[PDB]
PDB file of C-alpha atoms in Angstrom:
ATOM      1  CA  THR A 192     105.342  24.441  13.351  1.00 30.48           C
ATOM      2  CA  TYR A 193     109.021  23.404  14.065  1.00 30.84           C
ATOM      3  CA  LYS A 194     109.596  26.550  16.264  1.00 30.79           C
ATOM      4  CA  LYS A 195     106.107  27.612  17.559  1.00 29.16           C
ATOM      5  CA  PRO A 196     102.397  26.519  17.226  1.00 27.59           C
ATOM      6  CA  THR A 197     101.301  27.468  13.661  1.00 28.93           C
ATOM      7  CA  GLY A 198      97.520  27.270  12.971  1.00 27.90           C
ATOM      8  CA  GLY A 199      97.110  25.351  16.280  1.00 28.94           C
ATOM      9  CA  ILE A 200      99.389  22.350  15.349  1.00 28.43           C
ATOM     10  CA  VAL A 201     103.070  21.976  16.470  1.00 26.05           C
ATOM     11  CA  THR A 202     105.991  19.592  15.733  1.00 24.88           C
ATOM     12  CA  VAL A 203     107.358  17.577  18.728  1.00 24.80           C
ATOM     13  CA  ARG A 204     110.134  14.931  18.837  1.00 25.61           C
ATOM     14  CA  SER A 205     109.148  11.207  19.175  1.00 24.94           C
ATOM     15  CA  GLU A 206     110.982   8.638  21.433  1.00 24.34           C
ATOM     16  CA  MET A 207     113.516   7.828  18.586  1.00 26.82           C
ATOM     17  CA  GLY A 208     113.861  11.551  17.534  1.00 28.20           C
ATOM     18  CA  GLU A 209     111.363  11.421  14.581  1.00 26.47           C
ATOM     19  CA  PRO A 210     109.211  14.612  14.360  1.00 24.60           C
ATOM     20  CA  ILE A 211     105.381  14.331  14.785  1.00 25.49           C
ATOM     21  CA  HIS A 212     102.655  16.919  14.017  1.00 26.93           C
ATOM     22  CA  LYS A 213     100.117  16.944  16.882  1.00 28.79           C
ATOM     23  CA  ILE A 214      97.516  19.451  18.078  1.00 26.33           C
ATOM     24  CA  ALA A 215      99.053  22.209  20.307  1.00 25.57           C
ATOM     25  CA  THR A 216      97.177  21.061  23.490  1.00 26.53           C
ATOM     26  CA  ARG A 217      98.715  21.824  26.968  1.00 28.30           C
ATOM     27  CA  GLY A 218     100.001  18.167  27.128  1.00 28.33           C
ATOM     28  CA  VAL A 219     101.793  18.552  23.744  1.00 27.94           C
ATOM     29  CA  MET A 220     103.036  22.077  24.742  1.00 27.46           C
ATOM     30  CA  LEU A 221     104.626  20.521  27.915  1.00 26.94           C
ATOM     31  CA  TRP A 222     106.014  17.702  25.670  1.00 27.80           C
ATOM     32  CA  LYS A 223     107.630  20.390  23.423  1.00 26.60           C
ATOM     33  CA  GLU A 224     108.932  22.382  26.487  1.00 26.14           C
ATOM     34  CA  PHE A 225     110.620  19.156  27.855  1.00 26.56           C
ATOM     35  CA  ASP A 226     112.070  18.466  24.333  1.00 23.88           C
ATOM     36  CA  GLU A 227     113.700  21.984  24.353  1.00 23.66           C
ATOM     37  CA  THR A 228     114.832  21.958  28.068  1.00 23.97           C
ATOM     38  CA  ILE A 229     115.167  18.387  29.609  1.00 24.83           C
ATOM     39  CA  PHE A 230     115.252  15.566  26.995  1.00 24.81           C
ATOM     40  CA  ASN A 231     117.809  17.396  24.722  1.00 22.76           C
ATOM     41  CA  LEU A 232     120.347  17.495  27.673  1.00 20.93           C
ATOM     42  CA  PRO A 233     123.349  15.103  27.646  1.00 22.01           C
ATOM     43  CA  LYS A 234     122.888  11.843  29.681  1.00 23.63           C
ATOM     44  CA  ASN A 235     125.350  12.925  32.474  1.00 24.05           C
ATOM     45  CA  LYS A 236     123.548  16.324  33.030  1.00 24.67           C
ATOM     46  CA  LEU A 237     120.026  14.730  32.800  1.00 30.09           C
ATOM     47  CA  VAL A 238     119.828  13.492  36.447  1.00 28.94           C
ATOM     48  CA  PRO A 239     120.914  16.760  38.235  1.00 29.58           C
ATOM     49  CA  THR A 240     118.280  18.631  36.038  1.00 30.30           C
ATOM     50  CA  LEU A 241     115.489  16.201  37.162  1.00 27.27           C
ATOM     51  CA  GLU A 242     116.101  16.844  40.945  1.00 22.95           C
ATOM     52  CA  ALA A 243     116.757  20.572  40.154  1.00 27.49           C
ATOM     53  CA  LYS A 244     113.261  20.900  38.523  1.00 27.46           C
ATOM     54  CA  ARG A 245     111.536  17.985  40.392  1.00 30.72           C
ATOM     55  CA  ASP A 246     108.737  20.177  41.931  1.00 33.64           C
ATOM     56  CA  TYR A 247     108.200  22.139  38.649  1.00 35.24           C
ATOM     57  CA  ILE A 248     108.080  18.883  36.516  1.00 34.07           C
ATOM     58  CA  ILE A 249     105.608  17.208  38.946  1.00 29.43           C
ATOM     59  CA  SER A 250     103.290  20.309  39.122  1.00 28.46           C
ATOM     60  CA  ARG A 251     103.233  20.437  35.223  1.00 28.88           C
ATOM     61  CA  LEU A 252     102.673  16.585  34.834  1.00 31.48           C
ATOM     62  CA  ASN A 253      99.715  16.634  37.310  1.00 31.34           C
ATOM     63  CA  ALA A 254      98.278  19.806  35.642  1.00 32.27           C
ATOM     64  CA  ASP A 255      98.873  19.443  31.866  1.00 32.09           C
TER      65      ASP A 255
ATOM     66  CA  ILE B 269     110.341   6.688  28.064  1.00 31.95           C
ATOM     67  CA  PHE B 270     107.740   6.979  30.931  1.00 32.97           C
ATOM     68  CA  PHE B 271     106.769  10.438  29.506  1.00 33.72           C
ATOM     69  CA  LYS B 272     106.485   9.480  25.804  1.00 33.29           C
ATOM     70  CA  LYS B 273     105.751   5.684  25.513  1.00 34.87           C
ATOM     71  CA  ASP B 274     102.182   4.819  24.305  1.00 34.03           C
ATOM     72  CA  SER B 275     100.689   8.325  23.830  1.00 34.51           C
ATOM     73  CA  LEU B 276      98.253   7.498  20.945  1.00 37.44           C
ATOM     74  CA  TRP B 277      95.172   5.582  22.272  1.00 33.74           C
ATOM     75  CA  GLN B 278      94.190   8.265  24.911  1.00 33.29           C
ATOM     76  CA  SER B 279      92.556  10.602  22.266  1.00 33.30           C
ATOM     77  CA  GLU B 280      90.047   7.728  21.540  1.00 32.96           C
ATOM     78  CA  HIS B 281      89.292   7.003  25.272  1.00 34.26           C
ATOM     79  CA  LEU B 282      88.934  10.101  27.486  1.00 33.95           C
ATOM     80  CA  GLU B 283      87.286   7.922  30.217  1.00 35.84           C
ATOM     81  CA  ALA B 284      90.830   6.477  30.907  1.00 36.26           C
ATOM     82  CA  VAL B 285      92.504   9.953  31.141  1.00 34.56           C
ATOM     83  CA  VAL B 286      92.362  12.257  34.254  1.00 37.17           C
ATOM     84  CA  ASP B 287      89.261  14.617  34.310  1.00 38.57           C
ATOM     85  CA  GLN B 288      88.235  13.259  30.809  1.00 33.89           C
ATOM     86  CA  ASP B 289      90.371  16.299  29.762  1.00 34.25           C
ATOM     87  CA  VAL B 290      91.220  16.282  26.023  1.00 36.77           C
ATOM     88  CA  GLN B 291      93.871  19.052  26.528  1.00 38.29           C
ATOM     89  CA  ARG B 292      96.229  16.534  28.289  1.00 38.62           C
ATOM     90  CA  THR B 293      96.213  14.149  25.233  1.00 36.34           C
ATOM     91  CA  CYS B 294      98.192  14.017  21.918  1.00 36.84           C
ATOM     92  CA  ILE B 295      96.041  14.305  18.713  1.00 37.01           C
ATOM     93  CA  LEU B 296      98.051  13.749  15.466  1.00 35.26           C
ATOM     94  CA  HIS B 297      96.855  16.201  12.701  1.00 32.10           C
ATOM     95  CA  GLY B 298      98.480  17.726   9.572  1.00 31.24           C
ATOM     96  CA  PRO B 299      99.000  21.541   9.703  1.00 31.42           C
ATOM     97  CA  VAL B 300      97.919  21.807   6.001  1.00 35.94           C
ATOM     98  CA  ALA B 301      95.018  19.310   6.176  1.00 38.54           C
ATOM     99  CA  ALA B 302      93.607  21.165   9.268  1.00 40.60           C
ATOM    100  CA  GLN B 303      92.327  23.883   6.800  1.00 40.36           C
ATOM    101  CA  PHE B 304      89.629  21.501   5.366  1.00 41.52           C
ATOM    102  CA  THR B 305      88.572  19.781   8.675  1.00 40.91           C
ATOM    103  CA  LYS B 306      85.393  21.791   9.634  1.00 40.98           C
ATOM    104  CA  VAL B 307      82.293  19.436   9.736  1.00 39.13           C
ATOM    105  CA  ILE B 308      82.117  17.117  12.849  1.00 41.92           C
ATOM    106  CA  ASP B 309      80.474  13.601  12.490  1.00 43.44           C
ATOM    107  CA  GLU B 310      80.114  13.888   8.639  1.00 46.54           C
ATOM    108  CA  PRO B 311      79.679  10.189   7.559  1.00 44.61           C
ATOM    109  CA  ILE B 312      82.943   8.786   5.959  1.00 44.21           C
ATOM    110  CA  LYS B 313      80.796   7.976   2.853  1.00 40.93           C
ATOM    111  CA  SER B 314      79.529  11.618   2.555  1.00 41.89           C
ATOM    112  CA  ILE B 315      83.167  13.011   2.627  1.00 41.86           C
ATOM    113  CA  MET B 316      84.749  10.352   0.332  1.00 41.91           C
ATOM    114  CA  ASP B 317      81.851  10.476  -2.232  1.00 36.65           C
ATOM    115  CA  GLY B 318      81.756  14.346  -1.857  1.00 36.76           C
ATOM    116  CA  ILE B 319      85.446  14.449  -3.052  1.00 38.15           C
ATOM    117  CA  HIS B 320      84.774  11.897  -5.858  1.00 36.70           C
ATOM    118  CA  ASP B 321      81.635  13.855  -6.987  1.00 36.81           C
ATOM    119  CA  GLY B 322      83.797  17.036  -7.033  1.00 37.86           C
ATOM    120  CA  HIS B 323      86.486  15.335  -9.222  1.00 35.88           C
ATOM    121  CA  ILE B 324      83.936  13.804 -11.644  1.00 39.70           C
ATOM    122  CA  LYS B 325      81.816  17.076 -11.986  1.00 40.96           C
ATOM    123  CA  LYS B 326      84.938  19.225 -12.776  1.00 39.88           C
ATOM    124  CA  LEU B 327      86.558  16.538 -15.057  1.00 42.12           C
ATOM    125  CA  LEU B 328      83.207  16.163 -17.027  1.00 46.77           C
ATOM    126  CA  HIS B 329      82.960  20.024 -17.358  1.00 46.62           C
ATOM    127  CA  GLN B 330      86.604  20.301 -18.627  1.00 44.22           C
ATOM    128  CA  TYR B 331      87.160  17.244 -20.953  1.00 45.91           C
ATOM    129  CA  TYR B 332      83.647  15.900 -21.927  1.00 46.19           C
TER     130      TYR B 332
END
């Protein structure tokens, strides 16, 4: 579950960094994607990534 | 924070999510325990006494 959805459930990081097993729904898949791509990034390089992906992020948030 | 904060209640109120779409929400569920979850709306009693009746019936067969 740590790497990929295993039997339909997947592990995602909480707000404090604690893992959580949730159902692999589109919302939780986006949550995982943003844990692997955006949220993991160092504080300095966060903000340029948010403008860089702004239109992608918004289209995902409104969809899934 | 905006992304993650307070992502629990929604599973128990679709009427307050967009499109009443489950697939947006987070549902917390054990990968291992998902093997035994099969019967929807089985009364808590039925399940909890079902397990206890299992444990008694086997125990009685094996040690009495």
